[PDB]
Every structure is written in C-alpha cells, then in structure tokens.
Scaffold this active site. Structure first.
Site, PDB file in Angstrom:
ATOM      1  N   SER A 130       0.850  -1.206   0.070  1.00 42.10           N
ATOM      2  CA  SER A 130       0.113   0.089   0.092  1.00 42.10           C
ATOM      3  C   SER A 130       0.795   1.290   0.018  1.00 42.10           C
ATOM      4  O   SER A 130       0.363   2.415  -0.219  1.00 42.10           O
ATOM      5  CB  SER A 130      -1.034  -0.052   1.078  1.00 42.10           C
ATOM      6  OG  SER A 130      -2.181  -0.651   0.835  1.00 42.10           O
TER       7      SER A 130
ATOM      8  N   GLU B  51      -5.187  -3.572  -7.030  1.00 44.19           N
ATOM      9  CA  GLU B  51      -5.503  -4.287  -5.827  1.00 44.19           C
ATOM     10  C   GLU B  51      -6.376  -5.464  -5.993  1.00 44.19           C
ATOM     11  O   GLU B  51      -7.121  -5.218  -6.919  1.00 44.19           O
ATOM     12  CB  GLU B  51      -5.893  -3.379  -5.064  1.00 44.19           C
ATOM     13  CG  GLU B  51      -5.130  -2.325  -4.572  1.00 44.19           C
ATOM     14  CD  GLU B  51      -4.106  -2.762  -3.577  1.00 44.19           C
ATOM     15  OE1 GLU B  51      -3.238  -1.935  -3.076  1.00 44.19           O
ATOM     16  OE2 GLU B  51      -4.065  -3.898  -3.022  1.00 44.19           O
TER      17      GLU B  51
HETATM   18  C1  LIG Z   1      -4.958  -2.363   2.756  1.00 48.32           C
HETATM   19  C2  LIG Z   1      -3.549  -3.175   2.941  1.00 48.32           C
HETATM   20  C3  LIG Z   1      -2.773  -2.177   3.668  1.00 48.32           C
HETATM   21  O1  LIG Z   1      -1.477  -2.918   4.191  1.00 48.32           O
HETATM   22  O2  LIG Z   1      -2.636  -1.028   3.958  1.00 48.32           O
HETATM   23  N1  LIG Z   1      -3.779  -4.351   3.353  1.00 48.32           N
HETATM   24  C4  LIG Z   1      -3.733  -4.815   4.526  1.00 48.32           C
HETATM   25  O3  LIG Z   1      -3.758  -4.183   5.687  1.00 48.32           O
HETATM   26  C5  LIG Z   1      -3.861  -6.213   4.530  1.00 48.32           C
HETATM   27  C6  LIG Z   1      -5.188  -6.941   5.355  1.00 48.32           C
HETATM   28  C7  LIG Z   1      -6.261  -6.119   4.639  1.00 48.32           C
HETATM   29  C8  LIG Z   1      -6.463  -6.668   3.303  1.00 48.32           C
HETATM   30  C9  LIG Z   1      -5.060  -7.446   3.091  1.00 48.32           C
HETATM   31  C10 LIG Z   1      -5.159  -8.133   4.446  1.00 48.32           C
HETATM   32  C11 LIG Z   1      -3.756  -6.520   3.288  1.00 48.32           C
HETATM   33  C12 LIG Z   1      -3.940  -5.222   2.359  1.00 48.32           C
HETATM   34  O4  LIG Z   1      -4.134  -5.286   1.139  1.00 48.32           O
END
Ligand SMILES: C[C@@H](C(=O)O)N1C(=O)[C@@H]2[C@@H]3CC[C@@H](C3)[C@@H]2C1=O
Ligand SMILES: C[C@@H](C(=O)O)N1C(=O)[C@@H]2[C@@H]3CC[C@@H](C3)[C@@H]2C1=O
Ligand SMILES: C[C@H](C(=O)O)N1C(=O)[C@@H]2[C@@H]3CC[C@@H](C3)[C@@H]2C1=O
Length: 262
Positions: free
Chosen positions: A44, A140
């Site tokens: 992210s 994503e």
């Molecule tokens: C939104 C994103 C992030 O790191 O900001 N993300 C998560 O937090 C983890 C948990 C939530 C979705 C997946 C599992 C993974 C992800 O894409």
C-alpha cells in the site's frame, strides 16, 4: 558501515526477515541507507504515487478532484472501509485519494489507478518526476503478493525516500498540490504502530503504511522533528514464508535506531 547500519543489521538478524531503510535528513541532505538499493514489494505504500499522480493531473484540470467515480458492487475488493459506504453511488477523486491514503482503501486505489490509465500510468508519473526505480505492474489486491525475488510492484528504499522528499518537500507537485498531499499524509489513521511508534512524541509526521503476503510490513514517512529540518524515512520489511505475520514493531525499532543516531 556506520554504528546505525550495525544496529539495523542486529535488528534484522533477530527479526527473521529482510529490512530496508532509507533516511534523508534535509538539514544537510545526507542519507543513511540499509539495503538502500535492494528492491522490496511496496504494497500500500504505492498509494502515495497514485494519489500524487492524480494531484499532478489536477494542476491542469482545476475541477478534477471533484469529478465523480462510480462505485459498483463488483468493484469492491479485499479492504474497502470507505468504498463500501458508497457502493451504487459515486465518490469524488478527492474522496478516493483521501480514502486510499488515510484508510488504505483498496477499492479507492483501484479507482486512482484507472484514472491514470492503469498501473503503467502510475509508473509513467514516477518516471516524469525522476524516479527510474518505482514500478507498478498490477492493481489491488494482486499487487500485494510480495513474492521474494519478484520485481513486480517494487521499489528500493533509496528511490522511495527521494521521491517522497520531492513530492512533499520539493517541487515535483504544484504548491497547492504539495500542501494537499502533506495534509492527507498527516491525517493518516493507520500509522501509530509503525515508523511513528519509534519517534519522540513531540515530533510531528505523516506516513503511509503497507502490508501484504510474506509478512510484508512497510511504512514511508515525512517527519518534522522539534527544532530541526524535516526528515524523510522509508522502512520496508519482508519475510521468507508466505503466511508470515506482520511486524510493525520492527519498523518502529528501525525508526528508533534512526532517531537515536541523529
Ligand atoms: C490495505 C492494505 C494495507 O496494508 O494498507 N492491506 C492490509 O492491511 C492487509 C489486510 C487487509 C487486506 C489484506 C489483509 C492486506 C492489504 O491489502
Ligand atoms: C541473510 C540475512 C539477509 O537478510 O541477507 N537475513 C535473512 O534473509 C533472514 C533469514 C536469514 C538470516 C535471518 C533469517 C534474516 C536475515 O537477517
Ligand atoms: C471515515 C470518515 C467518516 O465519515 O466516517 N470519513 C471522512 O472523514 C471523510 C474523508 C476520509 C474518507 C472519506 C473522505 C470520508 C469518510 O468516510
């Protein structure tokens, strides 16, 4: 090999994974790097480049951030704390930018990527601001597969620190846009356990976190220490096993080491 690099090396060895760090101190433009030129999966943290690219577009389209984007039920992916509220309705590019940056909304990121013409549109913007390292290859959620040795959706700590500096403290964006980016980052909801956990409480900062498979745990921050010039700090971390657990504590420890060495 500085004292700081040896401390980071000790942290890495006890962490089970691979740590990458890049500090820029804008007081003197000096850098501290640990695996500074090694690639890591951004997860992210790539949302910063997408948001910034849309801000750049807004320099020549004054009303762009008010443009609506349809949110459909089929659009929702794996983490949509804001987009879920607006399914079958619309969100503006401003709303999507804030959702992506401050809540790490994955559907909002996909909308930013679409507005840029796809992942390569984000890479194109990075090239336009002098970042020859960043690459965004996927949307994503698959951009978070974070497979060791995979160059997709990666950058280096050195490149991301430089880019973050140019976006938030330099002239890569128009003044209004730079200010908006900083405002968004300082409003992040996700960062209190990561870089900022390792910093003196009196300091202020904005950041963008990321996490993914292989226990990948990332944070990139612009920091205003009390009484001195801003810092940019990037901390990337990743682990051998696909189902590894997150380690925000390692990022906090990295930041603490960096902070004590100032
Ligand atoms: C939104 C994103 C992030 O790191 O900001 N993300 C998560 O937090 C983890 C948990 C939530 C979705 C997946 C599992 C993974 C992800 O894409
Ligand atoms: C070899 C070293 C490195 O990053 O180059 N390293 C790792 O990859 C993981 C695994 C190997 C050693 C330790 C566990 C942790 C580490 O520091
Ligand atoms: C989380 C919060 C809320 O109302 O619950 N929220 C906002 O503050 C605004 C800005 C941040 C996300 C979006 C734009 C909108 C929102 O949902």
């Amino acid at each position: 090999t500085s004292a700081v690099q040896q401390k980071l090396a000790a942290l890495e060895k006890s962490s089970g994974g691979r740590l990458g760090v890049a500090l820029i101190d804008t007081a003197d433009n000096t850098q501290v790097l640990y695996r500074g030129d090694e690639r890591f999966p951004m997860c992210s943290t790539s949302k910063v480049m997408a948001a910034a690219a849309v801000l750049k577009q807004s320099e020549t389209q004054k009303q762009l951030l008010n443009q609506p984007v349809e949110i459909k039920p089929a659009d929702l992916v794996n983490y949509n704390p804001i987009a879920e509220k607006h399914v079958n309705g619309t969100m503006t590019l401003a709303e999507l930018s804030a959702a992506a940056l401050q809540y790490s909304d994955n559907t909002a990121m996909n909308k930013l990527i679409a507005q840029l013409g796809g992942p390569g549109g984000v890479t194109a913007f990075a090239r336009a601001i002098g970042d020859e390292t960043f690459r965004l290859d996927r949307t994503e959620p698959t951009l978070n597969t974070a497979i060791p040795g995979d160059p997709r959706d990666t950058t280096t700590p050195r490149a991301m620190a430089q880019t973050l500096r140019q976006l938030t403290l330099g002239h890569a964006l128009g003044e209004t846009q730079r200010a908006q980016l900083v405002t968004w980052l300082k409003g992040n909801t996700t960062g209190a356990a990561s870089i900022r956990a390792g910093l003196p409480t009196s300091w202020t900062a904005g950041d963008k976190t990321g996490s993914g498979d292989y226990g990948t745990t990332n944070d990139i921050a612009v920091i205003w220490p009390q009484g001195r010039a801003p810092l940019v700090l990037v901390t990337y971390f990743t682990q051998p096993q696909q189902n590894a657990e997150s380690r925000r504590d390692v990022l906090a420890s990295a930041a603490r080491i960096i902070a004590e060495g100032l």
